[PDB]
Design a protein around this ligand. Structure first.
Ligand SMILES: Nc1nc2ccn(CCCCc3csc(C(=O)N[C@@H](CCC(=O)O)C(=O)O)c3F)c2c(=O)[nH]1
Ligand SMILES: NCC(=O)N[C@@H]1O[C@H](COP(=O)([O-])[O-])[C@@H](O)[C@H]1O
Length: 200
């Protein structure tokens, strides 16, 4: 499968995915890395891996849909089959999400449906769970309300902060995200006609 990876910052998930798709049995191929914010470290790990990078600036488009279309042009230019959101902090418009329905994966640092949204670790710590984790799911029009592919639980140690909790969750992210991509690229997992996760 031809894969695009959309980032916004560090790209430690991107790096984790790069490492796995370089493996001989990878069903996946990272053909383009797109970022909405220039001069972010994800663009380096990508360039350091010899992967084309493209910066599309959401702040330069009048419409959110004009902005998604900028991305789809590149997705079609690179003949992409699968889109991985790896730290991408822009909500996509309905038609774009509909177009890539069942072809777009996201990594979210909670055990969904818990702690939907942008400050999941903050939420988890205020609530006081002792177990959190991360989730790979399909992007649906309901933000973080798509079909789950993989999940890994991670412990909340006492005295944790966003800094430490998120350090620990990210190690799990770096496992289930490559795994999930491989599941979808290989066609082992798909989005069933009934709209639930379908194993094959
Ligand atoms: N339909 C659908 N679309 C998309 C697009 C990306 N995702 C995955 C979740 C991304 C993480 C995320 C969760 S909330 C939020 C946010 O507040 N975004 C602000 C911009 C803030 C900023 O510019 O820093 C905004 O764009 O208004 C996020 F960025 C989805 C999805 O799951 N579903
Ligand atoms: N609400 C969405 C969200 O916060 N997603 C989070 O962004 C990070 C990407 O890190 P990276 O840039 O090092 O791959 C991840 O920690 C992921 O859980």
């Amino acid at each position: 499968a031809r894969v695009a990876v959309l980032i916004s910052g560090t790209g430690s998930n991107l790096q984790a995915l790069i490492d796995s798709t370089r493996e001989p049995n990878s069903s996946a191929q990272i053909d383009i890395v797109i970022s909405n914010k220039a001069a972010v470290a994800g663009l380096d790990k990508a360039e350091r891996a010899g992967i084309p990078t493209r910066v599309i600036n959401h702040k330069l488009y009048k419409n959110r849909v004009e902005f998604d279309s900028a991305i789809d042009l590149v997705l079609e230019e690179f003949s992409i089959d699968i889109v991985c959101l790896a730290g991408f902090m822009r909500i996509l418009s309905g038609p774009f999400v509909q177009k890539w329905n069942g072809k777009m994966l996201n990594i979210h640092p909670s055990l969904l449906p818990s702690f939907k949204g942008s400050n999941a670790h903050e939420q988890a710590l205020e609530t006081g769970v002792t177990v959190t984790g991360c989730t790979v799911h399909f992007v649906a029009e309901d933000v973080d309300a798509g079909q789950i592919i993989l999940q890994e639980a991670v412990p909340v140690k006492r005295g944790d902060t966003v800094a430490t909790l998120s350090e620990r969750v990210k190690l799990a992210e770096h496992k289930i995200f490559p795994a999930a991509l491989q599941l979808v690229a290989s066609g082992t997992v798909q989005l069933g006609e009934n709209g639930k996760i379908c194993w094959v």
